[PDB]
Amino acid sequence: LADGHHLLGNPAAKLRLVEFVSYTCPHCSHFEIESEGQLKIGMVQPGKGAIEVRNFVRDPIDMTVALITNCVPPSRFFTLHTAFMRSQAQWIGPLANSTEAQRQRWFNGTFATRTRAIASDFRFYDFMAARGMDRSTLDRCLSNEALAKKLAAETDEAINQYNVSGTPSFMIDGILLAGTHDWASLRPQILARLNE
Ligand SMILES: [Cl-]
Numbered sequence: 130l131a132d133g134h135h136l137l138g139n140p141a142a143k144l145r146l147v148e149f150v151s152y153t154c155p156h157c158s159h160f161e162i163e164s165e166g167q168l169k170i171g172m173v174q175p176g177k178g179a180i181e182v183r184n185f186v187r188d189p190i191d192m193t194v195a196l197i198t199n200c201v202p203p204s205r206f207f208t209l210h211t212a213f214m215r216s217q218a219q220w221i222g223p224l225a226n227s228t229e230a231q232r233q234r235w236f237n238g239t240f241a242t243r244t245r246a247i248a249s250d251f252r253f254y255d256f257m258a259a260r261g262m263d264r265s266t267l268d269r270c271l272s273n274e275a276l277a278k279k280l281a282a283e284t285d286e287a288i289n290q291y292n293v294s295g296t297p298s299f300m301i302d303g304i305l306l307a308g309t310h311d312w313a314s315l316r317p318q319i320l321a322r323l324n325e
């Protein structure tokens with residue numbers, strides 16, 4: 130699959146759930162905690178369906194996290210993606226707490242300068258060091274502007290083709306699910322399809 134797309138489970142499974150999610154969205158964090166287990170044991174493990182996670186990148190903080198999760202091998206993506214989502218409350222504090230002068234650096238200057246400022250402010254060096262990724266490996270990841278452009282293009286595809294606006298959003302078998310932005314609304318639609 131293309132950059133910013135990641136597939137969990139069997140590509141030939143009949144039910145394909147696409148998730149448009151963002152690392153800076155509180156609804157996506159809550160959704161991951163609520164849904165990850167049940168989707169795995171109920172659907173993915175028995176080979177009844179597969180999950181395509183798309184990084185819907187909303188802001189440069191999101192972009193910085195998505196550079197990290199997309200720079201690791203496919204077999205590490207899902208653990209890392211889940212970790213950022215599950216531990217969102219632990220790392221996202223500077224979004225609320227930072228001052229004007231700090232915020233200025235996230236939204237101005239070149240891609241490299243702002244990505245480095247964000248990674249510093251959000252303490253991603255320490256977060257990723259605690260997960261085996263050293264500073265040199267993280268530096269290379271954060272400077273991958275080519276990848277940032279591809280993730281931006283993937284995000285633009287979601288916005289343009291599917292009118293994706295709020296997060297998380299979902300499609301099942303090509304249909305974007307109206308009014309469906311949490312596990313409580315999603316699950317009955319998944320079970321209806323599985324149990325047809
Ligand atoms: Cl939820």
Ligand SMILES: [Cl-]
Pocket residue numbers: 248249251252253254255256
């Ligand atoms: Cl740090």
Ligand SMILES: [Cl-]
Pocket residue numbers: 285286287289290
């Ligand atoms: Cl498009």
